[PDB]
Amino acid sequence: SQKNGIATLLQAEKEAHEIVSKARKYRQDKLKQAKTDAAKEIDSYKIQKDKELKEF
């Protein structure tokens, strides 16, 4: 059980490290997404102002 037990440890540690990295990956990706989904809101509001500026 010497290398079976160590095998258990080694595999668990790879698996923990990867789940936590997946949540960290998720945070990076959401902050970039925030930067993206704010870029969309700006130019729909600007063209709204362009539309009623054209009425003048």
């Binding site: 160590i6 440890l9 080694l10 540690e13």
Partner: protein, 118 residues
């Protein structure tokens, strides 16, 4: 292997001169640090002990090890800088071995010249 040529998994290699004090450490570890140890042992020429552990509880196991006196370090040699670690350690130990010899030869030369003179 395939993890202890890096810093992915944590191992604590160490020498101890009492398997008796090692027993005492297993009880301690277990009470306050749970069963995150896997304990393996080999009889050496000392005793080779090994505790194996996570990478964020590293310092916690060390305190315990320190207090009962063991050489439990995460890597016990500093020659490391070639991959795998053991190749650098073997070349340094080939330099060490001849460097003591050369010293002895020098010691001898001076003993022959000056014992009578002394």
């Amino acid at each position: 292997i395939a993890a202890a040529i890096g810093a992915s998994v944590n191992y604590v290699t160490g020498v101890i001169a009492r398997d008796k004090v090692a027993t005492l450490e297993q009880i301690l570890w277990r009470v306050l640090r749970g069963n995150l140890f896997f304990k393996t042992v080999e009889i050496e020429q000392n005793a080779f002990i090994v505790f194996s552990h996570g990478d964020l509880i590293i310092k916690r196991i060390r305190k315990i090890a320190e207090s009962l006196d063991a050489n439990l370090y995460d890597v016990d040699s500093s020659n490391e800088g070639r991959s795998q670690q053991l190749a650098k350690v073997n070349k340094n130990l080939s330099d060490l071995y001849t460097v003591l010899k050369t010293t002895s030869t020098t010691l001898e030369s001076e003993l022959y010249a000056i014992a009578k003179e002394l």
